[PDB]
Structure 1
């Protein structure tokens, strides 16, 4: 029987997690729907999802949230990844000016056993792409290019993305802290 339960609702975030932490016998998987807080700060959102998800499942839970922060939009989308994705899918590469393209992709995990929350945050500095390129990802992976490469996240494979994406360094940190 597991000890920690990862709660997610996106079907592709689950497939990338189980590619990395799928063999661990002490990680379970739940799909409880919790009411998403909306805020620009990633530290605020991920710390409030852990209360909202512990109330739903009442087991030691792990939650996840992402953020895209563009310097042309002065920190927006931020942790508002739901209302921009429901309005600008990948047309968000058009609505920002073409002179300054730099942005930062950020991710956060928070695990809560009921007594205390612990937040892990990674971050990748990159720059937004001129047009949407690629299929293999979720939410903005066709329009984000990390610093150093010429290639987007969705143009990469799954092993290539998790060596650059923020959610790849978090899942290695989550393995060693929880002993998964």
Structure 2
């Protein structure tokens, strides 16, 4: 039986984390839907998301939340990236001026065993693409190009995307701190 449960309703996050942490027999999977608070700080939102998911499932839970801080928007959306990609689909490449396309793709895991919450944050420098290119991946992957690379997250495979994305450095930290 598992002892830690990764809660997500996003089925594309689920097959990413099962690609690397899938072989661990100590990790189960739940799909409870939680409501995030309104704040641009990633640390604040992921920390209030874990207590809201422990209240739902009542087992040691691991939640995940992201950020897409942009320099042209002074860090917006931040942790408000979920209703930007809903509203601005690929016009998000056009609302940002050409010449200052730089941004940060941040990502945070927070595990709550019921008495303490611990947050693990990784971060990837990059820049917004001039137009959405690429087919693979999911939300905002056709618009983000990491630093040094020329291709987007959508143009790379799942093994290549996780060698750049924040989740590829968060697998090793989550496995070490939880013994998965």
Cα distance in structure 2, aligned partners of 1:77 and 1:143:
14
Cα distance in structure 1, aligned partners of 2:144 and 2:167:
14
By how many angstroms is 1:35 displaced? 1.5
By how many angstroms is 1:137 displaced? 1.4
- Structure 1 window deviating more from structure 2 (82-91 vs 46-55): it is 82-91
Cα distance in structure 2, aligned partners of 1:179 and 1:155:
33
Cα distance in structure 1, aligned partners of 2:138 and 2:69:
16
Deviations 1:89-116 (A, max 9, x none): 2221111111211000000000000110
- Structure 1 window deviating more from structure 2 (56-65 vs 162-171): it is 162-171
- Structure 1 window deviating more from structure 2 (88-97 vs 158-167): it is 88-97
- Structure 1 window deviating more from structure 2 (112-121 vs 132-141): it is 132-141
Cα distance in structure 2, aligned partners of 1:9 and 1:47:
18
CA root-mean-square deviation: 0.8
Cα distance in structure 2, aligned partners of 1:169 and 1:141:
18
Cα distance in structure 2, aligned partners of 1:138 and 1:171:
19
SS at match of 1:34: coil
Cα distance in structure 2, aligned partners of 1:175 and 1:152:
27
SS at match of 1:70: coil
Runs (5+) with no aligned partner, structure 1: none
Cα distance in structure 1, aligned partners of 2:91 and 2:38:
21
Cα distance in structure 2, aligned partners of 1:137 and 1:86:
16
Cα distance in structure 1, aligned partners of 2:144 and 2:25:
34
Deviations 1:59-98 (A, max 9, x none): 0000000100100000001000221121012221111111
TM-score, with normalisation over the residues of structure 2? 0.98
- Structure 1 window deviating more from structure 2 (14-23 vs 84-93): it is 84-93
Runs (5+) with no aligned partner, structure 2: none
SS at match of 1:142: helix
Deviations 1:145-180 (A, max 9, x none): 000111111100000000100111112211111111
Runs (4 or more) in structure 1 with deviation over 3 Å come to: none
Q: May I ask how many residue pairs the two structures share in their alignment?
A: 180
